[PDB]
Symmetry: D3
Subunit: 233 residues, 6 copies
Amino acid sequence: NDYSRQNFQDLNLFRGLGEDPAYHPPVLTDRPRDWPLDRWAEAPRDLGYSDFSPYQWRGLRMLKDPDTQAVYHDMLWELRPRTIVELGVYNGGSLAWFRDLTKIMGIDCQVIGIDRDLSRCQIPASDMENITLHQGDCSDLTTFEHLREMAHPLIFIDNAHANTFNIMKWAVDHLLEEGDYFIIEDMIPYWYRYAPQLFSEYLGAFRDVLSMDMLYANASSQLDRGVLRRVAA
Amino acid sequence: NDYSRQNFQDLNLFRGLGEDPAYHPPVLTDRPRDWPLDRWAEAPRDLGYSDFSPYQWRGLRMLKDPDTQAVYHDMLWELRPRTIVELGVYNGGSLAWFRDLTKIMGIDCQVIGIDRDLSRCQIPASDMENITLHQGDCSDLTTFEHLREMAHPLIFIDNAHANTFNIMKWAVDHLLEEGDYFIIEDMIPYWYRYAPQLFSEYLGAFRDVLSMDMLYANASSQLDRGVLRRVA
Amino acid sequence: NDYSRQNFQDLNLFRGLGEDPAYHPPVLTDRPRDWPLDRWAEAPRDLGYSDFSPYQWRGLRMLKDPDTQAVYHDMLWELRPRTIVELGVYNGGSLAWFRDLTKIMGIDCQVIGIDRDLSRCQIPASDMENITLHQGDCSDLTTFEHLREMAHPLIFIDNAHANTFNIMKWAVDHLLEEGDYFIIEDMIPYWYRYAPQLFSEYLGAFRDVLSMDMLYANASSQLDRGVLRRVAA
Amino acid sequence: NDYSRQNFQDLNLFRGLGEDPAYHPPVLTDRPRDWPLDRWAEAPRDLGYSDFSPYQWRGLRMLKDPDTQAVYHDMLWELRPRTIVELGVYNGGSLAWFRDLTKIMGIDCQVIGIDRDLSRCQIPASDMENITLHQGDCSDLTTFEHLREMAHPLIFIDNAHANTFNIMKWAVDHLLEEGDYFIIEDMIPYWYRYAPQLFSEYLGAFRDVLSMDMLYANASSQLDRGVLRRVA
Amino acid sequence: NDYSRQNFQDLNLFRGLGEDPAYHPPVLTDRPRDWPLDRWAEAPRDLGYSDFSPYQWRGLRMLKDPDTQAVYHDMLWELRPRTIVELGVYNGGSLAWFRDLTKIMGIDCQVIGIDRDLSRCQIPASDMENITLHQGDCSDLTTFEHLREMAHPLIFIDNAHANTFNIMKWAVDHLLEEGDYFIIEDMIPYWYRYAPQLFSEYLGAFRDVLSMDMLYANASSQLDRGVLRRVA
Amino acid sequence: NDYSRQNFQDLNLFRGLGEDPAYHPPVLTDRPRDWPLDRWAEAPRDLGYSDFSPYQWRGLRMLKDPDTQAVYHDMLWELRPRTIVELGVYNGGSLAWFRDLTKIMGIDCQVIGIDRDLSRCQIPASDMENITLHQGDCSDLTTFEHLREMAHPLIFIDNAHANTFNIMKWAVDHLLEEGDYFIIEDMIPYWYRYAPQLFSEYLGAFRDVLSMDMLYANASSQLDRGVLRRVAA
């Protein structure tokens, strides 16, 4: 009856993201927010709403969860990066977070976000000091040429996962110095599950130039086995 | 420095599929195939290889796992379908299974397979009986308008998950008769997770045409609340 | 009261078997079969019925569950047995299954079922091509003498668990050839549990003639640690 | 070789019971008993032997585990039974436990065990005070009906599982008074798995005479849903 | 044998805190920090060190774990407190965090720590902007009187848990305005476990003045059922 | 209202013990005691009450759970101790138990209990045979000095945890002989979590005098890695 002349959107677009880049607080449905203390023991114990992607940072959605934030905090504190690069931006929450966190730490850090599509970015123009947004394209490597001009140390973070190994070869040869991080969030465990032989070969090809950092690599489900850095040349 | 001269295939292409459409028997790494019986108790208890998609049917890879296979066995025995349609073929294992199973049940069933790329299908020529392949895109409703007429009852299976709700729409107005299935494997639970609001509106738009068949919808992790059918 | 009336069957007779050897599909008792799509998310998430042995093959009950079926399929495809023997028949579901699967693979296989009690066999006589039943007592080795006439490779399957180790001893001495399987379903983990010393001694006495096939021994809970085959002398 | 030297006993005889009715203390195989304290963190953290039936009472094996022991303790304290009956004996560990436990609690209680085979009973002749052994067949009610006029309250325990629904009918009419227990240990969950319809129908038949004691029925896995008592 | 030479500090002093108020980075103990990529699949998958209280903020230990930090983040953003009070200080790590997180948010917030022992504090005098440390006793209630004269909204956090119920009475009667929070961290699940009736009675006494806030109360294991506020 | 005119006990007093040293049977709250057998399958499958310390012994509260009781039984059966010392008494439940058990075993055993506060003891003097009680602080070694000559073999059990290592040193030097046990219930795993470095130093300082009995050390969650005795290697 109601499926009539409707163009149904492709729900695959909202994968790992959600419907809305803007942040809205969770709302309770099956209980009152103000539970009475005389009935305190009868109150339900579950969260009350979806824990899909519930985190925020100053009113922007944060796709990086608390355990991941904790790892990056330690990494920032130890490395004191002059440059953090995000390939894959979405709403920009994690950019502002990296910027904020580096400011509180007293680290002179320029944060850079690269994406094919920047139209979902929720960072207001007034809150953009030391955050630069570049419109790029993973399959074209000359995109990345800009900002070999940038300062070190440097953390390069892949959240896009398109031409990753090629981008890695570029970064190793043209960008990273010893100590710099190249990080692949989320995807490495899935590539190993689906393509165990090719994955092991491809990662293994970078063994003279990149190490898995074992202090951080097992510390969150999002960074699981994906934290690499440049070994001594 | 092997990264310097090396062709990096795009690894996302294998998502949900594997790296090779042809079947290869599992290989044991950290044990012998023959475990000595006087040390029986000290044998490892784990599988010995990855359980990603280790299933086969007659030398062809099978991406439908044993409990999914059992559900379809029951469905095919109840419904006695004269057509089965697979949106998404890959190596063709499931096509060959559906055809073999219906034949062994005594059921005259045509199996139809639709895919963007049929260059991966592994079904030997010598047994393509009652299988019809079609090459086409899912983002194109034209791929379905071109289909010739099919017998009933019918089962339509979505293993491709592109433009799925528009295809459901086309299927309800131009294909499905009362008692015919439209099954979305795998994806329903993810779509609810990622886009609960829109998923809900979309599914509920079919409230007067499709229902969820609770006999089968909770019977396997792959078919999990995705087995629908046409009600009067 | 209702109890003074009844006769009360021995419920131990249905151990591992169920009440009725004939197949009837599951039925939903506490929800509609057709759940409305506007309330999809409210739908109950559990199976809906008993998960004991709700399995079938062409309207006969299947006591071997899906994972077990998957192991036998790989085993049949690799080995291509000329003979499969089921010690312990019940309804014949696995007999019909084995025969159907070998026909589909183009294998010339004679399926043989041995039991003291053949009265629960549900296979129609019109559908007994390449299946043979045979009456016999497990403790009487005469029961198995006609097996020596059969072609190989051979898979011998114990679903009876009476006199098992003497039957194994006999199979090694008079029946089994290199490559043939001797398989004990279900019982071996229990025998190890209740009598670890005698069980380890008994199994280990076959160390020169049989081995545990580790490609199949861990692949199903029913076949768990019970898949054995004849090694080379 | 060795399989031909062997006289193979039937291992189904040992089901639920173990190989030897006499108690032997567990032994470590892959560690020293005395772990050096300077490598305390290196010590393995598993049990170190099989937990099939590791329990004992005063040198006799105990087939009832600590969780079950604790329920029977509370039940004895509340009910203060003059008689505890055990259908099925084995080594008599639980018979001696029931006796010793009622003695320290000050309860005057005769313990009676009944079995087809009493030759496995490990209880010393000179430690058999307030314990009676009775030979008899379960699928045959002459065993039960003759030996009677036992004092109340009463606890009747099934550890045999032979003709249980008929023994239950005999007990409600000719033995049990209000507040007495009839307990089926272990077997209730299996009869429900294998015969849901026949089992629900049979227990439902006793609806006006027995009930499930909910204070004790969920409190151990052996007693799981098998604690019944005589409500009038 | 140097048990008779050794001097034993009270290990109870470190319960829930650790040996050292100063932060030190985790030490890797049975693996290299740099795992070679040709052996990537063979790298161990566990953390590499103890997950006891491994967290930090800007070189200071953080006893509030990331899940709890996420809850307080939302709370600060929503409430926008002018005052945050921590009953129990230790190293000052969460004092510094609260202050930093409110500056970042553009909120004008004074942060206050109260403990009988402030000598474990690790915050340099360099950066005590909007942080005040007060010498306090949980048994004395004159201790808390300085808090009355300062701005709301207000979050009051008990990390000390001595004479808590009297402090909640004082706070309700003399401090908390509508909107303001009283948060007991960690202990409520334990008090209810050990003292269900007395705890239910005691919490029950605040039914007209405080309510449990279900948005934040189940969102972390440290705040579990302990987030209360002056409302209703 | 009720809060402002209510006297609040310090709830930390009850940590690890409960509100009442006297035993009260559990009580069903949301179901009838007697469930009807026509609705047997529809019966709830959980305990129906709180499992904090539901355990008793002859009308006295038991804080040691059944698993711990089974270990101590085996310990008593093998060691056949003449003395059993409990540091920590609370209600005396365990004292009455140890005494009863040794008596039923034929073991002539004196049970000693030590606590700063004996006022919660619930054991009737009518059954106080072979039970001695002392009043004293643990933080004072004098409490252990004033103890008389005790018979061996011996089990010394710590349930108080106040100055455990100096008490251990006093035990080893002045009390324990070949075979005697020193057991620390509950606390060892917490000291190891909160202070791994200082705990490993202190325990390993007894490496010549005490050793962890592996037959019992892993046999219960309460006695976990805390069962020590004066034996070599």
